[PDB]
Scaffold this active site. Structure first.
Site, PDB file in Angstrom:
ATOM      1  N   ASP A  35       0.847  -1.203   0.000  1.00  0.00           N
ATOM      2  CA  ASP A  35       0.000   0.000   0.000  1.00  0.00           C
ATOM      3  C   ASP A  35       0.885   1.256   0.000  1.00  0.00           C
ATOM      4  OD1 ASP A  35      -1.965   1.879   0.256  1.00  0.00           O
ATOM      5  OD2 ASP A  35      -2.500   1.280   2.353  1.00  0.00           O
ATOM      6  N   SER A 199       0.354  15.464 -12.406  1.00  0.00           N
ATOM      7  CA  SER A 199       0.201  15.069 -13.809  1.00  0.00           C
ATOM      8  C   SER A 199       0.072  16.309 -14.668  1.00  0.00           C
ATOM      9  CB  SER A 199      -1.028  14.147 -13.931  1.00  0.00           C
ATOM     10  OG  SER A 199      -1.343  13.883 -15.264  1.00  0.00           O
TER      11      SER A 199
END
Length: 330
Positions: A35, A199
């Protein structure tokens, strides 16, 4: 040193991936969910409330000659999805894929929430976010990666998740055979304890690329891709009959549809998520309404590049003094 372990989807939808981890002496092998959005290594154990265990493999510290109680230490975690667990702490030897850490904090669950009990295939979590998010009190503990870092050939791990197929987590090296083209690296902010990056934009299907900064985290523990509502609406507008359902809790689409791809930018590079990766199947068994793999982050407070996005790429988690993320096509 290096380690290399295969990660396997828990079901036919890739809802999560499990990776075998050896704990203690003699080894007890538990299948953990790696995780990158949390920083606790916790396990189902001999101490877990018996009514909260339903098929998981448990860690029994009393059977490990290397286990030691970390006296006074407790932990309690609440995840972004409402799930939780808590317990006490042992140190023990932990090995992943041949890479061994001695003195690793192994958080033994006394209590787990219903979603963990119901997942018989997941025996715990191995957190790979920054150790600043570790919940052990009164002495915060290090992640497996932070403890291994100094011994590794290079201070990196890589995630290579499969679509409906196994993949690989590597520690301490970059498998140059595992990806195509070059790896594009991008800056990371550790201010929130996550692998947080920006991004450079997106495209839907064969559409034009929209240059726009989208801050978000790279989170292997999240199944889906959560993006701003503007972006998500632009994607689902290209699917006939797609709609946001308050009753289901997100965008759904007709199971008869062919989904467009989704492209996200990493610097000047582009990662393409094929349409099939965005299909999470019927909302209930036999339904002709299917759940979408791209959902709004509105109300979550952060954008999340979960497995839907990461499985489209070879991902480098660079834990050098200045952390960075790398993405390649594969």
């Amino acid at each position: 040193s290096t380690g290399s372990a295969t990660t396997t989807p828990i079901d036919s939808l890739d809802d999560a991936y499990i990776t075998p981890v050896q704990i203690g002496t003699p080894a007890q092998t538990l299948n953990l969910d790696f995780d990158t959005g949390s920083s606790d290594l916790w396990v189902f154990s001999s101490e877990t409330t018996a009514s909260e265990v339903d098929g998981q493999t448990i860690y029994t510290p009393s059977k490990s000659t290397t286990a030691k109680l970390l006296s006074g230490a407790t932990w309690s975690i609440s995840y972004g999805d409402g799930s939780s667990s808590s317990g006490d702490v042992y140190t023990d030897t932990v090995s992943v894929g041949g890479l061994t850490v001695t003195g690793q904090a192994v958080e033994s669950a006394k209590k787990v929430s219903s979603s963990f009990t119901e997942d018989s295939t997941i025996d715990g979590l191995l957190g790979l976010a920054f150790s600043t998010l570790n919940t052990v009190s009164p002495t915060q503990q290090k992640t497996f990666f932070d403890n291994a870092k100094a011994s590794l050939d290079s201070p990196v791990f890589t995630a290579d998740l499969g679509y409906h197929a196994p993949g690989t987590y590597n520690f301490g090296f970059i498998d140059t055979t595992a990806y195509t083209g070059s790896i594009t690296y991008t800056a990371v902010s550790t201010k929130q304890g996550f692998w947080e990056w920006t991004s450079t934009g997106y495209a839907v299907g064969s559409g034009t690329f929209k240059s726009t900064s989208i801050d978000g985290i790279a989170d292997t523990g999240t199944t889906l891709l959560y993006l701003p509502a503007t972006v998500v609406s632009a994607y689902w507008a290209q699917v006939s009959g797609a709609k946001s359902s308050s009753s289901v809790g997100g965008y759904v689409f007709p199971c008869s549809a062919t989904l467009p791809s989704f492209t996200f930018g990493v610097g000047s590079a582009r990662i393409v998520i094929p349409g099939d990766y965005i299909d999470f199947g019927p909302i209930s068994t036999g339904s002709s309404s299917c759940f979408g793999g791209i959902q709004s982050s509105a109300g979550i407070g952060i954008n999340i590049f979960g497995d839907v996005a990461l499985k489209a790429a070879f991902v480098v988690f660079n834990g050098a003094t200045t952390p960075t993320l790398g993405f390649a096509s594969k």
